[PDB]
Automatic annotation (TrEMBL), chain B:
Chain residues that bind Mg(2+) 1: 11, 177
PANTHER family per record: TUBULIN (PTHR11588)
One GO BP: microtubule-based process
Binding of GTP, residues: 11-12, 97-99, 138, 141-144, 176, 181, 204, 222, 226
Organism of derivation: Sus scrofa (Pig)
Database matches in Gene3D superfamilies: Helix hairpin bin, Tubulin/FtsZ, C-terminal domain, Tubulin/FtsZ, GTPase domain
Signal peptide residue numbers: none
Main location: cytoplasm
Presence of the UniProt keyword Cytoplasm in the record: yes
Keyword Nucleotide-binding: yes
Role played: Tubulin is the major constituent of microtubules, a cylinder consisting of laterally associated linear protofilaments composed of alpha- and beta-tubulin heterodimers. Microtubules grow by the addition of GTP-tubulin dimers to the microtubule end, where a stabilizing cap forms. Below the cap, tubulin dimers are in GDP-bound state, owing to GTPase activity of alpha-tubulin.
Protein name: Tubulin beta chain
């Protein structure tokens, strides 16, 4: 749901939420199959990786919708280190406008101080670096 | 709620405002008498943006009319919509400016400005939460330039927080109708660059070009030009009046358009345009509107956008359309003509969409561009100004009314500085 | 040459004492260093400055920097330059609490008087000493403030109207109907200064009990008249001395601003940001053409954005020589503002001034021709 390639990073955690006619044998087999594949990379310090939940109520269908009626549904919430990539792109744009102080007077005229820009940028840089170390292989 | 106050000065401004009021009224459904005769229920939801209530379930527009010659006031009253306005707002005098900026700004306008300001204060006090002003006038004239500039200065002094707009007709390059156009245009721009918050530059030559080439008319009159300008004026501020998927207040347009305080001159545009008898051939849709909107022939500013770079641009759509098509088209336009867009703004297209299109137009789009090429216009005036100031061609008429050469010199310097700023970004390279 | 700079460290203030804080600014000679409390053992930073003043102590002389020392370092040279015939300018800079007013005005009760009182004192002392039959002097004063993009006069009594700004085509920007007053005794200028400081607009805030809501400019026009009736002519040299006190950057949420105070802070911040932009642009401009090739790339500096930059057109660049006085707060909590002050002071160092003395070209050409004929006469006589 976000324009970032998960293959460039490593998966750190995963939650699966199943709705409908689902059995634990099938989800165990699915988890084993996903663990077998090589394209999906898990960090070394999370040997388990997966959390599973199952619910009986199947999803509903709104009149005039577009999704079809289905018997089984899945929602995944995955914590990966690919996100950073998207942040990096946005940072570039910010710099290209902040070198010339474009549009800054609108912000300053409503109570903001100029320096408050720069601090935030540095703060952002700090978060990104901590998403590049949490994934370095242990030694 | 967002109330707008409308002011009109001079022959050009008054006629444009009359046609504009004849338009908005239809969009909201108001009879010439004042009573409401409409069909939809959204028309009264936000009628207070422009109109005030009156006891007999009547609506009166929130306009002010200004001049120093009763002729235009008589013409407006003796007209189809003369009875819609409040009589007390017809402020005027005698012995008009006579195409002299000094008489308009210092001698004659200084007497009537107090009454005009009293009416403006009375009108603005009743508003629940005033948004901004807008004023229509012509720079090449007398009354219009002087009194409009004086009113802009005073109102900015009194109401520093609110938005000020202007729809000004600038002198054309070749089609000329006054011999002392450059003096008035320069003296007016010297103050417009400082005081107002937005400005839309109209040129008669561009409107005639659109009428003859696109609309394929045979005898255009000033009514059609007023039509085009009124269409644009109505389309700019649609999102205050009707619901939509992406709203765009005037302040939002101001923030996204101008990157620096002194660069608030825009080129407007409107689409579509089928010239009639050929509507059956053109398929109306989103990419067709985008194609017509960015074309050079459509622009009303009489300046080629291909000679510079777009500092930025805004598009306001009206209709029922998909958001993906709009976003894809704006991205495609940005990527295709990559040379003509400035490179240190990563994305320089503002988008808004409204659900209620015009009376009989399944779709429509308004365009507000901010590009360096506008400098050409100023250069023309400056050149002509020098050609008449080196020998003091008609100067005494101004000096008899209480001016001096220093005023002319500082105005010329300020406009030249504006031209230099706009030229600073025009060339490629620059980058980081 | 370039601009002069005199950074000064302020002592602790009770707001920084009730809330615990630590000194972070160190300095030695021309160098001034700052360490990031955020993460230590990361990257100590240093900067080079012509002058630097320590003011944490007072009875002890351990690197202590009295106001008299600052005056002797900057104002004495500037007064000498003014007597030579250069227009000269001082301008203060920093943030709410830095101590720009302490340096400019100081305290009337204290012997430690600010730069402007001491400059006026020394100027009148030299006028009294050097007056003669063949040498005389004239002095006039003016004092203006910029509140919110409006120029207001201070010596002029209560006048509700504002003053217009107009550009003379040859002499540049100026302000029309400024009450320009002459002076003949130190008492007159002292009383005028007291009245001006009294009539200034000042409001209280969390950062300072008595803060300034307006930029202030003090101007002295000084004329030398050489009256050797046999040979010389009068009104030979005219000089302009400008002393500028700027408002301190407002952080809004930290200052407890609200209502009108917030709008004043916003206008002050807009003016300061415009000033920073010109300073950076002018510095880059002079730096580039000086070393790059010499092409005189036509990137022009934009001063018509704010009245502050517009009225200081000449002092920032042109026929004026100048100095920047950046005050600094040593408290650890005030880290980012201190870094901004340091960086913009360093940028201001890169700026080049081009003060030049000018007189009537006819007189100059006559003198040059007189020297030429003297040379030729010496040639043929030999
Ligand atoms: C029969 C029909 O639908 O044909 C169109 C038509 O052919 C075109 C050419 C129309 C036509 O416009 C012109 O010919 C014209 C002439 C002089 C100046 C400006 C325009 C049209 O007259 C104009 C008319 O526009 C409207 O009625 C809008 O709702 C518009 N009208 C007004 O500006 C107006 C004027 C006076 C009183 C009340 C309204 C509008 C926009 C916003 C809010 C309210 C109204 C329309 C669609 C057409 C015709 C009739 C041919 C165009 O104009 C507009 C505003 O739609 C010209 O460019 C568009 C594209 C259209 O395809
Ligand atoms: N060297 C110093 N010795 C003693 N007190 C000082 C010194 N420098 C500054 N101060 C004090 O610092 C406080 C604030 O100084 P001030 O000059 O008002 O700051 P500012 O940064 O110029 N802000 P503003 O008042 O708005 O112009 C006052 O109490 C000064 O007396
Ligand atoms: N677009 C448009 N321009 C007009 C109209 N009437 C006059 N003008 C232009 O206005 C200019 C003269 O300005 P004028 O109205 O006399 O200014 P005033 O005397 O101060 O009111 C001329 O260059 C005309 O081209 C009109 O109805 N529409």
């Amino acid at each position: 749901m976000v324009k970032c390639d998960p293959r460039h990073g490593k998966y750190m955690a995963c939650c699966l939420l199943y709705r409908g006619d689902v059995v634990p044998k099938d989800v165990n087999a699915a988890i084993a199959t996903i663990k077998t594949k090589r394209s999906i990379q898990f960090v070394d310090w999370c040997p388990t990786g997966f959390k599973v939940g199952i619910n009986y109520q199947p999803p509903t269908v709104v009149p005039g919708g577009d999704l079809a009626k289905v018997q089984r549904a899945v929602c995944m919430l995955s914590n990966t280190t690919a996100i950073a990539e998207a942040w990096a792109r946005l940072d570039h744009k910010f710099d290209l406008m902040y070198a010339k102080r474009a549009f800054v007077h609108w912000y300053v005229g409503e109570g903001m101080e100029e320096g408050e820009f720069s601090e935030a940028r540095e703060d952002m840089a700090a978060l990104e670096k901590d998403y590049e170390e949490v994934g370095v292989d242990s030694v | 709620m967002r109330e707008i106050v409308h002011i009109q000065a001079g022959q050009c401004g008054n006629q444009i405002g009359a046609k504009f009021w004849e338009v908005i009224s239809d969009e909201h459904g108001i009879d010439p008498t004042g009573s409401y005769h409409g069909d939809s229920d959204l028309q009264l939801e936000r009628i207070n943006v422009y109109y005030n209530e009156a006891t007999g379930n009547k609506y009166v527009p929130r306009a002010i009319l200004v001049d120093l010659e009763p002729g235009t006031m008589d013409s407006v009253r003796s007209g189809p919509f003369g009875q819609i306005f409040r009589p007390d707002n017809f402020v005027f005098g005698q012995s008009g400016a006579g195409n002299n900026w000094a008489k308009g700004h210092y001698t004659e306008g200084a007497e009537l400005v107090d009454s005009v300001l009293d009416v403006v204060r009375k009108e603005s006090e009743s508003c629940d939460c005033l948004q901004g002003f807008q004023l229509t006038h012509s720079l090449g004239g007398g009354t219009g330039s002087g009194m409009g500039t004086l009113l802009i200065s005073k109102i900015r002094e009194e109401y520093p927080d609110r938005i000020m707009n202007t729809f000004s007709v600038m002198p054309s390059p070749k089609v000329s109708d006054t011999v002392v156009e450059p003096y008035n245009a320069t003296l007016s721009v010297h103050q417009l660059v400082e005081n107002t918050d937005e400005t839309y530059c109209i040129d008669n030559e561009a409107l005639y070009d659109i009428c003859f080439r696109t609309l394929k008319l045979t005898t255009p009159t000033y009514g059609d030009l007023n039509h085009l300008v009124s269409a644009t004026m109505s389309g700019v501020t649609t999102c205050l009046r009707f619901p939509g998927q992406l709203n765009a207040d005037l302040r939002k347009l101001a923030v996204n358009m101008v990157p620096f305080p002194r660069l608030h001159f825009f080129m407007p545009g409107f689409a579509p345009l089928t010239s009639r008898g050929s509507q059956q051939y053109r398929a109306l849709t989103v990419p067709e509107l985008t194609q017509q909107m960015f074309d050079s022939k459509n622009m009303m500013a009489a300046c080629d956008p291909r000679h510079g770079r777009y500092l930025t641009v805004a598009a306001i759509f009206r209709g029922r359309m998909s958001m993906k098509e709009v976003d894809e088209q704006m991205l495609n336009v940005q990527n295709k003509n990559s040379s003509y867009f400035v490179e240190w703004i990563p994305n320089n297209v503002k988008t808004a969409v409204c659900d209620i299109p015009p009376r009989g137009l399944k779709m429509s789009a308004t365009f507000i561009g901010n590009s360096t090429a506008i400098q050409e216009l100023f250069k023309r005036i400056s050149e002509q100004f020098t050609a008449m100031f080196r020998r003091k061609a008609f100067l005494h008429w101004y000096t008899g009314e209480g001016m001096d050469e220093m005023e002319f010199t500082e105005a010329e310097s300020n406009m030249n500085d504006l031209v230099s700023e706009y030229q600073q970004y025009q060339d490629a390279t620059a980058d980081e | 040459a370039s601009v002069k700079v005199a950074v000064r460290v302020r002592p602790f203030n009770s707001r920084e004492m009730s809330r615990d804080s630590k000194c972070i600014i160190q300095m030695s000679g021309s160098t001034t260093t700052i360490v990031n409390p955020k993460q230590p053992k990361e990257t100590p930073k240093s900067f080079s400055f012509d002058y630097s003043y320590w003011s944490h102590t007072s009875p002890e002389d351990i690197n202590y920097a009295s106001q008299k020392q600052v005056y002797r370092d900057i104002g004495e040279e500037m007064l000498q330059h003014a007597f030579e015939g250069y227009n000269v300018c001082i301008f203060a800079y920093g943030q709410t609490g830095a101590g720009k007013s302490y340096t400019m005005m100081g305290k009337q009760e204290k012997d430690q008087q600010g730069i402007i009182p001491q400059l006026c004192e020394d100027l009148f002392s030299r006028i009294n000493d050097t007056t003669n039959d063949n040498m005389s002097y004239s002095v006039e004063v003016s004092y203006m403030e910029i509140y919110c993009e409006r120029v207001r006069d201070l010596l002029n009594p209560k006048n509700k109207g504002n003053l217009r700004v107009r550009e003379h085509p040859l002499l540049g920007p100026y302000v029309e109907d400024l009450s320009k007053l002459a002076v003949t005794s130190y008492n007159d200028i002292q009383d005028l200064m007291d009245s001006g400081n009294k009539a200034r607009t000042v409001a209280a805030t969390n950062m300072n009990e008595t803060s300034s809501r307006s930029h202030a400019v003090f101007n002295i026009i000084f004329t030398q008249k050489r009256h050797d009736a046999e040979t010389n002519i009068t009104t030979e040299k005219v000089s302009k001395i400008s002393l500028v006190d700027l408002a301190g950057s407002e952080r809004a949420d930290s200052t407890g601003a609200k209502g009108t105070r917030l709008k004043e802070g916003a206008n002050i911040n807009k003016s300061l940001t415009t000033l920073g932009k010109v300073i950076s642009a002018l510095a880059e401009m002079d730096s580039g053409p000086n070393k790059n090739k010499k092409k005189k790339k036509t990137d022009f500096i934009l001063y018509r954005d704010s009245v502050l930059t517009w009225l200081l057109r000449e002092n920032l660049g042109g026929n004026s020589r100048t100095a920047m006085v950046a005050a600094l707060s040593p408290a650890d909590i005030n880290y980012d503002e201190t870094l901004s002050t340091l960086r913009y002071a360093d940028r201001a160092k890169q700026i080049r001034c081009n003060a030049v003395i000018n007189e009537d070209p006819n007189n100059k050409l006559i003198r040059e021709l007189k020297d030429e004929v003297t040379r030729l006469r010496d040639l043929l006589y030999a």
